[PDB]
């Protein structure tokens, strides 16, 4: 059965540029190709149907082209709302098959993270748990290191991280770092520290609190 290969897994570009995401079929006498946009955490939207036709309410800067094997979704004048995964569906033969997709990355200016640290809630403590949370919000590029320190000494154990996708407005990323300890460990120490190292400064951004204060 027909494979749709999208050889770029990630495609990089600037606001107002032109980008082509390509999709190369394993067979076909077809213009039986549809193109979709899936923005993070929601459902796909048809952009282009029958290789080179525009779905209603799709703005004029999205165009499609190609025959047989190779197909090209062109995005002119890229906007930040175009942050999404773009993929083709082959509908010439059964089974219908999908490209694995190209996530468009938008290049923007370096921005430093806004860092905030939060002690365990007292609700969490009354339950025997103690999570310390640190948000590093709205920074670029994505590359970032978080160091946790307890009474001045690095903890790598019990730190769980999670990154958002690139924001569709400001093209930034954000990250959440949670240090999970038990209440029993948490109460034996005073000083808790989140340190964010980002290319935007050679100095770490340091957020801390004392449990006793």
């Amino acid at each position: 059965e027909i494979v749709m290969t999208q050889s770029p897994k990630f495609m990089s570009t600037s606001i107002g540029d032109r980008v082509n995401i390509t999709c190369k079929a394993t067979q076909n006498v077809r213009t039986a190709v549809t193109w979709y946009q899936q923005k993070p955490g929601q459902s796909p939207q048809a952009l282009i149907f029958l290789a080179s036709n525009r779905h209603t309410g799709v703005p004029a800067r999205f165009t499609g082209s190609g025959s047989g094997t190779d197909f090209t979704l062109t995005i002119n004048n890229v906007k930040s709302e175009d942050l999404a995964d773009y993929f083709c569906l082959q509908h010439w033969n059964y089974p219908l098959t999908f490209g694995s997709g190209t996530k468009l990355e938008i290049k923007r200016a370096d921005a430093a993270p806004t860092v905030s640290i939060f002690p365990p809630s007292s609700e969490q403590l009354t339950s025997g748990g103690a999570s310390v949370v640190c948000f590093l919000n709205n920074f670029y590029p994505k590359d970032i290191n978080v160091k946790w320190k307890i009474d001045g000494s690095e903890r790598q154990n019990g730190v769980l991280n999670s990154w958002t996708d690139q924001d569709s407005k400001d093209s930034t990323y954000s990250m959440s770092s949670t240090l999970t300890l038990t209440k029993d460990e948490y109460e034996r120490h005073n000083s808790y520290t989140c340190e964010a190292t980002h290319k935007t400064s050679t100095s770490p951004i340091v957020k801390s609190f004392n449990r006793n204060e």
Binding site: P95, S116, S131, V133, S176, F209
Partner: protein, 219 residues
């Protein structure tokens, strides 16, 4: 005005059947195909099968043996049944309209299916209020830590949806068979705590909702 809405189980035990209902509006099942497609965690989309306008069905040969697709014309519902679920049937399951007998023009919201033996566990929701007045910034960031739930997903909003600018809801992480996520919101400092901020967490699998108000700390 074409809409499609999956309703499914959220959690399914190994070897039990999945069934999902796709309720549609804005077209007639009679005139258009409806396909079922899925997206397992970090993999391509996979088409499962279709039921066309005139009633006939084709399936992906991979699933033929345990798939069935039917519909109820009078309710505008397409039903999927997939038997013998194994953990690798975990995925987001979508139904989608066709343009008659051609293009898949419109996609439903998707419903998450996790194949697992374990219990449903609701989240504990913990408010994240800043530590002792760590200065005036003109903005304050607040959060909810949503800990200890299974399966995915949870939905987070703030003041029931009125507060949507400057929200980050992070993907969940899995530790010791339970998920955890956190969400932040940033509002002007003059306005909190005088104008209240509450995160609302829905965990559909467990039919639970918690609305947690963020109050400044006592410490």
């Amino acid at each position: 005005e074409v809409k499609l809405l999956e309703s499914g189980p959220g959690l399914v035990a190994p070897s039990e059947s999945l069934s999902i209902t796709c309720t549609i509006s804005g077209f007639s099942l009679t005139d258009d195909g409806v396909s079922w497609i899925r997206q397992p965690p970090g993999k391509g989309l996979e088409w499962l099968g279709v039921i066309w306008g005139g009633g006939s069905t084709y399936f992906n040969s991979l699933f033929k043996s345990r798939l069935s697709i039917t519909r109820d014309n009078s309710k505008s519902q397409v039903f999927l049944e997939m038997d013998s679920l194994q953990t690798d049937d975990t995925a987001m399951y979508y139904c989608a309209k066709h343009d008659g007998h051609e293009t898949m023009d419109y996609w439903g919201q998707g419903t998450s299916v996790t194949v697992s033996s374990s219990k449903t566990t609701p989240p504990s929701v913990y408010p994240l209020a800043p530590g002792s007045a760590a200065q005036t910034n003109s903005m304050v960031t607040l959060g909810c830590l949503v800990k200890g739930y299974f399966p995915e997903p949870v939905t987070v909003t703030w003041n029931s949806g009125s507060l949507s600018s400057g929200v980050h809801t992070f993907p969940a992480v899995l530790q010791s068979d339970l998920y955890t996520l956190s969400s932040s919101v940033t509002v002007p400092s003059s306005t909190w705590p005088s104008e209240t901020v509450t995160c609302n967490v829905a965990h559909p699998a467990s039919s639970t909702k918690v609305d947690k108000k963020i109050v400044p700390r006592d410490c």
